């Protein structure tokens, strides 16, 4: 009958103190005869009750989608605590459960590298600025591009791909106008990871 998925915090919500990370328990395909869904949260086997339930919204496919969401702690997500939802419904022989930890593996920090646009690409109307992010574990990460305090826009970032000695890497291409580039503006690649000093580093790129 019902079916349920468990979801981690947004990378960046977990790596900045400013923000507050959440784990989210989605229970799709809830009946409407027996729509009533009850939860139990556990953090490493330890049940916790401070955890809100989101407005119950109707899906238009003859089912309900009811979500529970549970605040977690930056401190103790990155450390490895194992969060576990636990749905029970009348339309359901036994309670279902899944457990969303993070990535079991030593944290390893990412190297960042800013690779200028190729000599052969100054003909084109626009040039590509490159950010090589290499050698991080887990692959949970955030990457952005800025310039002179301003959030440079038309960029695009490959997904993390496993890299042979256990680690992870991605690229991120920023596309600027050949003009801007030759003016000599600096463009920075900004990178957040649990294995960074203060979770943050920023590397620069310019004529």
């Amino acid at each position: 009958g019902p079916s349920v998925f468990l979801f981690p915090p947004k990378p960046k919500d977990t790596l900045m103190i400013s923000r507050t990370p959440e784990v989210t328990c989605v229970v799709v395909d809830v009946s409407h005869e027996d729509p009533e869904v009850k939860f139990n949260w556990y953090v490493d086997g330890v049940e916790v009750h401070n955890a809100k339930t989101k407005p119950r919204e109707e899906q238009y496919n003859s089912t309900y989608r009811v979500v529970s969401v549970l605040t977690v702690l930056h401190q103790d997500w990155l450390n490895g605590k194992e969060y576990k939802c636990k749905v029970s419904n009348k339309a359901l022989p036994a309670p279902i459960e899944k457990t969303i930890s993070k990535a079991k593996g030593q944290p390893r920090e990412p190297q960042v590298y800013t690779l200028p646009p190729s000599r052969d690409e100054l003909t084109k109307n626009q040039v590509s600025l490159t950010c090589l992010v290499k050698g991080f574990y887990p692959s949970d990460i955030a990457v952005e591009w800025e310039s002179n305090g301003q959030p440079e826009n038309n960029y695009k970032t490959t997904p993390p791909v496993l890299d042979s000695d256990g680690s992870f890497f991605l690229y991120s291409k920023l596309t600027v106008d050949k003009s801007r580039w030759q003016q000599g503006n600096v463009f920075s690649c900004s990178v957040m990871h649990e294995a960074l000093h203060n979770h943050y580093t920023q590397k620069s790129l310019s004529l």
Binding site: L15, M16, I17, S18, E144, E146, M192, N198, H199, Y200
Partner: peptide
């Protein structure tokens, strides 16, 4: 001293 992204506190040490 602390890390800032877009002026929003990341993490301090």
């Amino acid at each position: 001293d602390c890390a800032y992204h877009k002026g929003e506190l990341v993490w301090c040490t």
